[PDB]
Symmetry: C5
Amino acid sequence: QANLMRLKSDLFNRSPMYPGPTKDDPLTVTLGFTLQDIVKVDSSTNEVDLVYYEQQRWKLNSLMWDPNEYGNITDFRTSAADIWTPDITAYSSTRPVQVLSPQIAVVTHDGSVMFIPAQRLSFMCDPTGVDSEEGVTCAVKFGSWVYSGFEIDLKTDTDQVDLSSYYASSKYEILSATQTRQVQHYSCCPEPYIDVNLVVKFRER
Amino acid sequence: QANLMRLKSDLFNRSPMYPGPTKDDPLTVTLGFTLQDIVKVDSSTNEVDLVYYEQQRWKLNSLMWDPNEYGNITDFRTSAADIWTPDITAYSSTRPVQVLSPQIAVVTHDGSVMFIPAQRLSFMCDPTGVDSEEGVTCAVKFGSWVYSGFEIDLKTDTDQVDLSSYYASSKYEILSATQTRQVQHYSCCPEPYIDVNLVVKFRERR
Amino acid sequence: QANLMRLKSDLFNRSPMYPGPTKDDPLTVTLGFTLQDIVKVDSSTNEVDLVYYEQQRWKLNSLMWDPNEYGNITDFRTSAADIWTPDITAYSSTRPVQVLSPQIAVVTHDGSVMFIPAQRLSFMCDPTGVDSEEGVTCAVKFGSWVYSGFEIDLKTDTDQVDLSSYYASSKYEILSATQTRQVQHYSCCPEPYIDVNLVVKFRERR
Amino acid sequence: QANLMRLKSDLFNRSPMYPGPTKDDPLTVTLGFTLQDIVKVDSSTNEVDLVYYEQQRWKLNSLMWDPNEYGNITDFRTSAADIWTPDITAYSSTRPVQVLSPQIAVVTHDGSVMFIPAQRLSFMCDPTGVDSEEGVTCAVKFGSWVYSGFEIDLKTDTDQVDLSSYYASSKYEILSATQTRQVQHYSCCPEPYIDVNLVVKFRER
Amino acid sequence: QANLMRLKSDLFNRSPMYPGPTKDDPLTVTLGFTLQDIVKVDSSTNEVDLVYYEQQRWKLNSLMWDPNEYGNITDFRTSAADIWTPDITAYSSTRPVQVLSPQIAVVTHDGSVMFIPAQRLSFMCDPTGVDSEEGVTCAVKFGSWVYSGFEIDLKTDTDQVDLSSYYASSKYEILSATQTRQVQHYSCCPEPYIDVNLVVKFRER
Ligand SMILES: c1ccc(C2CCN(CCc3cc4ccccc4[nH]3)CC2)cc1
């Protein structure tokens, strides 16, 4: 207990928080989606509600330590407020995202961080043809709101969304769910922007 | 009031907060559910709303004291923000949980903590057959979001949910309610994962 | 303004906040309800919404002062966040209570505190028979969530709920509204538990 | 910018916040309503929703300064959290009031404060007869929750609610809107209770 | 990293926050709208819900630095709470605006600030004729709530709202969307007030 208290004090109370990446020191953020349920479909407003959990991973040199100096502690859990977290947001949401899980991250001695928020998201989708055999395709882009591809490099481990935790008695059946890295340009900035496109094909069970 | 002010100052202002359990220092958390009401059933979205209070108890050596050194004070009440609390959550919720009670915990001189938040939860459940004699079975898993079974040992005193405070004029009658501890070794890694599966069998009152 | 600034500084900046009552130093809290309106009745979920004022009164020796030492100031108003407040909650609510008034309390030189939050509460009630001449009876208990009768002694001035401020053009007419103090004993602990049962008999106007 | 930074520091960092009025030092608060729209009417719950802005004015000696000592600055804007604000509330609301504007106040060198929060309020009103030619009359009292007329003297500039900003394509048309000050006296206590009774007569367009 | 941590410390911890503009030191705020979707239309309450990005740009001398003194850092990202932000609000909203993006701003070495909050707004609009070929015209004014045209000079880059990110499968089709600067005079003091009128002509798809 004493060694962990000493580690947290040395990492967070001694030095200031990580101020975010720069062009000279970019950061790689790996995203992964686990789709739990398509809760609601609104044909009158063209909104679809998803329940999912987003796995986020990044590495910081400022969060590194030698386990031998801290009673062989290799990892710990801390409030997400105690550390820097990437500004990953849905680009086509219609309501503020609702958090369904505790905001706690796991820090490893090599500086690796894992943050897995469970969320409910309302996003822009026309559900016409959901009642058919062919179904309907919905798509939402996830990315850093303010950091370009020069500061935050977004990645996926696989393009396959995890559907092993998908609610078996859901109103909607998943036909396909993919997560793809895209490099986009905007009438904003000449720098490239990176997003992860979550594409879900579904129909009424 | 002076002895309690002195105790709170010695326990919270002198030392930093408990940083959570580790594999070398695991923590046992006892979980208990008291079901008060099945408020809403949504057949179009497959959501069911429960009102219940979740009893949580754990013991910390850092929260121990000698009552004789603090005017024979054996226990006290403090804001849940002043102490560490386990990250126990519903794994299949559809809305952020709503708190219906003050966020205050009871600390005993032996280091025991009791925190009983009253909550309204919307979770995933197909209520088809609720209008029948047989009823319908809903299930929701509770556990630590970030800690494994090597850090947090989640347990239940009984597998029976307390139904003594269940609303008598509820729209739904409950037929059975169990709280069972489950160990899931199947995930990735050699570490086990623990959860309390709250299983409720219910039907429309008649 | 200078004398009040000096008083608030001496009462709040000099000493830490009151840490709550103990068995050795209990606190009496007087509770009173002023029913303003029965806003909503939900026959499909068995929820009833009330708008009421909850008068709360307690006395603290730490909040006492001599008016002669502070320019003859006998009382003042302060944010409820600057002082300790009792954890009085509804035992059968279905939604987090909504606050409709500023969270400010009145402190008197004898240490008396007056806190009257205006609230909207959704609680468990079957409103079947509200459309009848006889009406329907709803009940909701109020009490400390974590303190027993040995730490917080809950009291009422009267058995009657103040209906003088009840909305005259409400959808529902009040036939009777009582607030009764109840002492309960549970098998698990020897301490008595106190609650105020708010019982309201009402029907659809005319 | 330097003179304003110096003024704010001298007014807020040097001295503690105004502790509120007393019987010996009473404060006059001038209240004014600008009705923007009657959004919703609920015949099943007897609730009416208004969108309006509430002009509040008071004067404090602690907020006075000599413009000549601060680069001829006669007034400034500050967050409402930096200053004391009166506890003016609706006495018959059914939902917590929703704030539609930034919580910023204007302070003048003579100690005058102007705070104009834009709000959405749900209050108790039977709207039976709104669909008729005669319309319906709704009333809602506003006043200090904890201060009596001996501490806060509530006033109005006019009896007329400002309707110059009322939404022209509203579902409901305003037939009359008064803003009248009332004194309530009791036999028990010598303390008067002051309120501003906002009375609105309206019908469906 | 070290140079950025040093820059943020020198800009925010050394000096107090920007206290806002004055008549003697006015500020130009550039406003731009990117309409993403007309989510909801409520014919019973006369409310229309929009999802848009509000680009805000201003320049402060207090936020200037020499990149050469800070490891050639030309820009950075910081929480909107760490800096002053203009009180730009919708004048005819019916609900508190909902934020759909992280509250982070970009600061450039010349003192330029870019803040782009993504929002969901419910505002006053009669949607009668939306089901027709001609459609319906909705308008909503945006401006500083407490600052006059003598303190905050509101500007636009173009008269045209960015519709390149408008949801293609929306329930409503955009016929025209303009953002125009207006100098209006209110019932208060003789100082002019500036706004940006967002006018949207739309119909059912
Ligand atoms: C402490 C002191 C005052 C108040 C308010 C005073 C103004 N009243 C509207 C009219 C009113 C009723 C009423 C009932 C008891 C005593 C004084 C009262 N004044 C609303 C309550 C609240 C808390």
